[PDB]
Design a protein around this nucleic acid. Structure first.
Ligand code: MG
Ligand code: MG
Ligand code: MG
Ligand code: MG
Ligand code: MG
Ligand code: MG
Ligand code: MG
Ligand code: MG
Ligand code: MG
Ligand code: MG
Ligand code: MG
Ligand code: MG
Ligand code: MG
Ligand code: MG
Ligand code: MG
Ligand code: MG
Ligand code: MG
Ligand code: MG
Ligand code: MG
Ligand code: MG
Ligand code: MG
Ligand code: MG
Ligand code: MG
Ligand code: MG
Ligand code: MG
Ligand code: MG
Lengths: 216, 46, 178, 41, 202, 97, 124, 26, 141
RNA sequence: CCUCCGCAUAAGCCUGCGUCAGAUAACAACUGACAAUUAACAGCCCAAUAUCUACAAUCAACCAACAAGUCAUUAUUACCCUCACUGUCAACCCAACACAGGCAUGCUCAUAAGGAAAGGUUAAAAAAAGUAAAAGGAACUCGGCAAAUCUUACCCC
RNA sequence: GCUACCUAAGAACAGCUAAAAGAGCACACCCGUCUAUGUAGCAAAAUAGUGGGAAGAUUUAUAGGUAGAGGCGACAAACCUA
RNA sequence: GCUAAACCUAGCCCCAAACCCACUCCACCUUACUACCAGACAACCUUAGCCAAACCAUUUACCCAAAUAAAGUAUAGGCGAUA
């Protein structure tokens, strides 16, 4: 967008300041093990995580992950943006809270068919603003209900009474540099081979090519 | 016939009639510049 | 001959050029005098190159790589001039005892404002020339009232200022417990 | 200014209240209403 | 700059600052408790504890400081959120943004005790300055920090147009008592037999 | 419109501070202080009125008589004009004559 | 009508003022004999340019050099550091007087010297 | 600004009356 | 020198000499097509062609054939928010015709992480297809 | 299709439709940035003392006058060098406006230059400016005002 | 700096008659006789046509002078910055 | 529902106390802000008037050196207003 600046004449010097923009979540992810059709690196990542915080355990992590999932979805239902910020990353906040605005949402944790299970653990390098971040992946397989109502309170799709089997790979991350940092949801895997969700009861069209006044 | 066009600009006549030097030569002109700086007007002369 | 108006072509198209610290007036004092005479032209060439660069940048509608470089050379040359002025002034005060190196005197104009009238260079004396005699270095009695009025203006200004700052002190001391 | 009236709004809106149902600019304006409301009374 | 200028988070001269504070703006000023530079004991990079406001009951490292508004901006503490992406078609990626903090709202921290301890402002026996802790006295050093002018005084290299340190420090001055122009004249070797005549001055 | 939508800030009035608790003290000093000082010299104020009562033109003539020499030119001009207007008003204009 | 705030310049006046005003350029010669101008190499200034060969000073200073406190030069300092050695050695070895002060270095009267100091003829 | 708060209080009461008339509670 | 009184001369006397000159100059690219030998400079109002010629011959050591001068007017038409006239500083321009065969030509000057994270997330972003129907794509159900 | 206009100099204002971007009768004459008019043209002058200067112009020859006219040097002294500085743009100035008004000079006297009376439609009244008119030809009218035509004689001041 | 008058040195007046002209016809030019339009007008005095003069007591550019108990005035009690 | 409406600061006024002002880089009395030449060029003057007197003509407070009082007395005055 620099050509318009040149042509207008809004010349400016580069951003010069001793201050630095501090964040708490790296954009994207480091490594995503592709799911199947249905190691030493993880061990080293676990050892680094332990070195940074000796008080850590892998066996209890799935339980707290499940708890974070359910509480974050309840906070979505209630519109608890503050709790959701505290327990979710700034990369995960937008894609989660952008489209749900101007409408409500419902989510209930019925039960968990299979227990949540870790898949991989990754660790960051020293060349992140002189900081580091640790990531974990966890498969979760449960049954829940969802039903959205738009601005006017009418159902978009989904039913609150009938749950549906669901399987996902949740990604958590934490800032190991600060003491206040905690694990928070970052992104998802959404593998291609996974099936599509239920469509919407409403029908839809799309516009064709806007034929500039010349046949094609 | 038609008025309003009285001011025919001439810079030499302008500065001779209302120049710093004339106002400093006339004693009252000194009082002119004094009242003018007193009020704080920017241009003391024309 | 003419390329010295430009930096190294290596620097062309570069957004950030290396630049060292500016000159220190203490350092220039410590240095010799002909060294300063040479450094003056060095800084001249540098500043000309920088001005050409910034003007071409304004023409091409872009920013310059290192603007602080300009102010660096500027205050360097300023420190040089200051040091030389200090040397020559100390010399003048040792020899004669004059501080300004340009003759003048406090004189009362027609407006009553006393001013440090400086002297120009003339060939013939003031009692023979006719232009200088017309400057009329004196004030008349009717100026007294106007002087009183400017004094009143200055007094009102100072009083307004001091009353303002007193009221400010009062309000914030009231607001804060201390 | 040291003393200024603040309740003009209320002390005129009572008249306008009594003149609400009138027609034209009388119901809205005051000086057109005062001459009429006293007449109505 | 105009009188009663507002020193916001952005610095003077920036595009955002000149958009927020044009030359014609005349808003209410800001009231701050007087704080002499000698009484000032808050420098950047120092550990600071917060105990009120949002995210109260924590500590962190100062990102920077504004002496005008008596503000201190700390890393990752008292942070709201803002978008930075183009809102035209893209939603706008979120990022946390810090808020400033007052010197009365914040308290320094002891390095070894890492607790909030108020301060006294003394002169050590060797001078020239010392900042000391509360009931149990600990000498608090100053934080270390990259100046803005020189990016690195240690990892610095002398460029071509940069002069060497030995040449810069070496002096060749001679109190010859003579004038610069005369010195340069005999340095050139030139001469001028003509004598400057007197002239009047008035 | 003159009314304001929001309330103003509440006026804090510390009915017990230095001068409100000290008010009026040393006013009978002349009566029960064996007459060393009268309350007229006690008050703080201008010099053309320290224990004096008077209307507009009285005050004007008094202040030009007393502190008129120290006055600015414009102020003294406005004051002379004021005494002139007040003289001619009080003496020529009004009822009761 | 006419504008006052704009500063007076050669552009504004008639041909005569346009010719006589001048835009700050200083004199170089004079004009006589039917508008025949004549400059003089004397009044023409002469820039004094030394050679830069064997010249290692550079316009920029490296940050490695340490800070040095201010030392504003002054007459007493210069005299006590430059002339005091000669004065004291001549005192404690030979004999002198207020006379013969030009030996130690002093201009009793400024005239007869090229570089006058008050008023100074030279510039900068 | 027209100083005083009695009129502002009176008008706040008028305003809340209008607000209740406009969106009365159940 | 600028802002400096010269010593008055009368015939039969010494010659004026400058040691620390104050005059500064700016080469500039032109807008009008000048020939190859011609150069242009932006300079103050006090300088003149002869002393600029000596300046070039001495300081930069380049042969000078001829010089012309011109004065440009800064437009005082601009107005601030106070309706006050804003004037751009006037400036003199010098046109130097070079010596035998220099043939000068103004060369070209300008021919040729947070942002990493930004573009990373931007290219990671996927546009909401229309068949979704404005639904949040985060949920699995 | 018009040009009773134009070009330039002077006087006058001072960057005021040149390049780039913008939103904003129509939206460039509006804003931000960029560049600009280069002296030979015209201004910017004359060392002193004393001294000289009867005889217009009108194609200046004759004639012819009256209002009696715009121009010259000389002897002496002293006199080295040199062309620097300034204006150079525009659709422009005075009239509150992009005002049918006013404006000196040289050339062009119908233009080689410069311009556009109509936003589109219908062709009602009344109104303005023109064109044509049967027979009569001032009978209108305070008055041959106006228009048309090319005409005589007499009174008052 | 409009206007009345004056001062210094300047400029303009085609062509056709008479061939001398404070003469005639008539451009440019100056003025404003009559009619109509316009009347918040294009215009705080104009437009269109018609008219008087147009080598002189002419018109006009430039700078200067005459300042209110006054100036100037081919006295219209005119003009002297609408 | 728009147009709008609302704010509290800037600062200012009255007093008191205290006496106050000037780049010293360049330029500025010629046509001010302009680097540089033979002139003999210099100020010391009651204020008046409006108004009041129901007209107006003598006259009609306006300070020049302690606040109060004497005293609005002695006095003056078309012996009137008034001072
Ligand atoms: Mg006017
Ligand atoms: Mg005229
Ligand atoms: Mg209403
Ligand atoms: Mg004006
Ligand atoms: Mg030129
Ligand atoms: Mg010439
Ligand atoms: Mg031209
Ligand atoms: Mg005319
Ligand atoms: Mg054409
Ligand atoms: Mg048209
Ligand atoms: Mg039409
Ligand atoms: Mg007929
Ligand atoms: Mg008949
Ligand atoms: Mg009849
Ligand atoms: Mg009849
Ligand atoms: Mg009749
Ligand atoms: Mg006349
Ligand atoms: Mg003729
Ligand atoms: Mg005739
Ligand atoms: Mg008539
Ligand atoms: Mg007729
Ligand atoms: Mg005629
Ligand atoms: Mg005639
Ligand atoms: Mg008569
Ligand atoms: Mg009469
Ligand atoms: Mg009288």
């Amino acid at each position: 967008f620099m050509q318009h600046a040149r042509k207008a004449g809004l010349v400016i010097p580069p951003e010069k300041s001793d201050r630095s923009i501090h964040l708490a979540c790296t954009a994207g992810i480091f490594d995503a093990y592709v799911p199947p059709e249905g190691t030493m690196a993880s061990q080293v990542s676990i050892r680094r995580i332990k070195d940074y915080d000796a008080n850590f355990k892998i066996k209890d992590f799935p339980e707290k992950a499940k708890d974070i999932f359910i509480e974050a979805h309840l906070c979505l239902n209630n519109s608890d943006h503050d709790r959701l910020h505290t327990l979710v990353t700034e990369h995960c906040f937008p894609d989660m809270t952008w489209d749900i605005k101007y409408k409500t949402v419902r989510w209930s944790f019925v039960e968990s068919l299979e227990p949540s299970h870790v898949v991989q653990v990754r660790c960051s390098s020293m060349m992140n603003q002189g900081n580091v971040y640790g990531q974990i992946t966890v498969r979760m397989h449960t049954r829940q209900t969802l039903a959205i109502y738009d601005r006017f309170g009418r159902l978009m799709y989904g039913q609150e009474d009938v749950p549906k089997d669901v399987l996902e790979y949740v990604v958590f991350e934490k800032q190991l540099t600060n003491p206040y940092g905690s694990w928070r949801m970052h992104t998802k895997i959404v593998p291609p081979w996974a099936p599509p969700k239920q469509p919407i009861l409403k029908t839809v069209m799309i516009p064709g090519p806007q034929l500039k006044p010349e046949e094609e | 016939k038609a008025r309003g066009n009285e001011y025919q600009p001439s810079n030499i006549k302008r500065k001779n009639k209302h120049g710093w030097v004339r106002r400093l030569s006339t004693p009252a002109g000194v009082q002119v510049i004094l009242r003018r700086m007193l009020k704080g007007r920017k241009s003391l002369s024309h | 001959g003419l390329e010295e108006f430009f930096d190294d072509p290596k620097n062309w198209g570069q957004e950030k050029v290396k630049s060292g610290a500016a000159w220190t007036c203490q350092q220039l004092r410590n240095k010799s005098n002909e060294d300063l005479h040479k450094l003056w032209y060095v800084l001249l060439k540098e500043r000309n190159m920088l001005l050409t660069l910034e003007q071409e940048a304004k023409r091409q509608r872009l920013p310059m790589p290192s603007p602080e470089r300009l102010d660096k050379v500027v205050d360097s040359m300023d420190a040089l001039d200051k040091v030389v002025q200090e040397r020559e002034d100390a010399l003048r005060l040792l020899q004669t005892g004059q501080e300004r190196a340009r003759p003048g005197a406090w004189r009362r104009d027609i407006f009553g404002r006393i001013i440090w009238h400086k002297f120009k260079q003339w060939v013939i004396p003031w009692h023979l020339n006719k232009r200088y005699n017309r400057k009329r270095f004196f004030a008349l009695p009717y100026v007294d009232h106007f002087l009183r009025l400017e004094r009143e203006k200055r007094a009102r200004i100072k009083a307004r200022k001091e009353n303002l700052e007193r009221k400010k002190a009062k309000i914030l001391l009231k607001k804060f417990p201390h | 200014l040291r003393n200024r009236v603040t309740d003009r709004y209320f002390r005129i809106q009572e008249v306008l209240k009594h003149a609400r149902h009138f027609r034209g600019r009388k119901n809205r304006c005051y000086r057109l209403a005062v001459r009429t409301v006293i007449r109505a009374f | 700059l105009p009188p009663h200028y507002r020193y916001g988070m952005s610095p003077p001269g920036s595009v955002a600052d000149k958009r927020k504070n044009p030359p014609w703006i005349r808003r209410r000023p800001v009231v701050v408790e007087p704080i002499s530079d000698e009484d000032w004991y808050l420098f950047c990079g120092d550990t600071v504890e917060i105990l009120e406001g949002k995210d109260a009951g924590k500590q962190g490292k100062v990102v920077q400081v504004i002496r005008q508004r008596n503000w201190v901006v700390v890393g990752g503490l008292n942070t709201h959120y803002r978008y930075i992406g183009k809102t035209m078609d893209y939603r706008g990626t979120m990022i946390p943004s810090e808020a400033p903090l007052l010197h009365r709202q914040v308290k320094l921290v002891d390095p070894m005790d890492r607790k909030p301890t108020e301060i006294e402002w003394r002169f050590t026996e060797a001078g020239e300055r010392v900042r000391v802790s509360t009931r149990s006295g600990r000498i608090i050093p100053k934080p270390e920090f990259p100046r803005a002018d020189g990016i690195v005084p240690e990892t610095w290299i002398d460029g071509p147009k940069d002069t060497s340190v030995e040449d810069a420090l070496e002096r060749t001055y001679v109190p010859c008592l003579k004038t610069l122009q005369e010195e340069v004249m005999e340095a050139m070797g030139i001469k001028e037999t003509r004598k400057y005549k007197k002239v009047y001055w008035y | 419109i003159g009314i304001r939508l929001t309330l103003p800030p509440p006026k804090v009035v510390d009915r017990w501070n230095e001068k409100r608790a000290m008010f009026g003290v040393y006013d009978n000093i002349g009566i029960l202080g064996n007459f060393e000082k009268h309350p007229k010299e006690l008050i703080r104020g201008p010099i053309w009125l320290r224990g004096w009562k008077g209307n507009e033109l009285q005050r004007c003539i008094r202040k030009r008589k007393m502190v008129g020499s120290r006055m600015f030119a414009d102020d003294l001009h406005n004051l002379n004009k004021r005494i002139r207007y007040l003289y001619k008003h009080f003496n020529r204009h009004g009822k009761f004559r | 009508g006419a504008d006052r705030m704009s500063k007076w310049t050669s552009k504004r006046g008639p041909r005569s003022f346009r010719g006589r005003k001048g835009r700050g350029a200083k004199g170089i010669g004079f004009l006589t004999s039917g508008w025949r101008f004549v400059q003089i190499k004397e009044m023409v200034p002469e820039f004094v340019v030394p050679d830069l060969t064997g010249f290692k000073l550079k316009p920029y200073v490296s940050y490695l050099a340490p800070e040095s406190e201010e030392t504003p030069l002054t007459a007493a300092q210069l005299f006590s550091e430059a002339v005091a050695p000669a004065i004291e050695k001549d005192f404690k070895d030979g004999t002198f007087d207020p006379d013969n002060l030009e030996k130690y270095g002093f201009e009793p009267t400024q005239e007869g010297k090229l570089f006058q100091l008050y008023p100074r003829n030279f510039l900068r | 600004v027209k100083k005083g708060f009695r009129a502002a209080f009176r008008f706040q009461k008028e305003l809340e009356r209008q607000r209740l008339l406009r969106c009365p509670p159940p | 020198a600028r802002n400096v009184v010269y010593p008055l001369y009368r015939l039969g006397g010494p010659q004026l000499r400058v040691f620390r000159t104050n005059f500064f100059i700016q080469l500039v690219r032109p807008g009008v097509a000048q020939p190859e030998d011609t150069v242009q400079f932006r300079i103050p109002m006090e300088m003149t062609r002869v002393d600029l010629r000596n300046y070039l011959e001495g300081i930069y050591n380049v042969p000078v054939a001829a010089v012309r001068t011109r004065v440009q007017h800064g437009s005082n038409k601009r107005r601030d928010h106070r309706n006050v006239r804003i004037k751009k500083p006037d400036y003199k321009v010098a046109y130097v015709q070079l010596a035998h065969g220099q043939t000068f030509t103004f060369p070209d000057l300008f021919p040729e992480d947070l942002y990493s994270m930004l573009e990373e997330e931007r290219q990671q972003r996927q546009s909401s297809d229309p068949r979704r129907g404005g639904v949040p794509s985060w949920f699995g159900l």
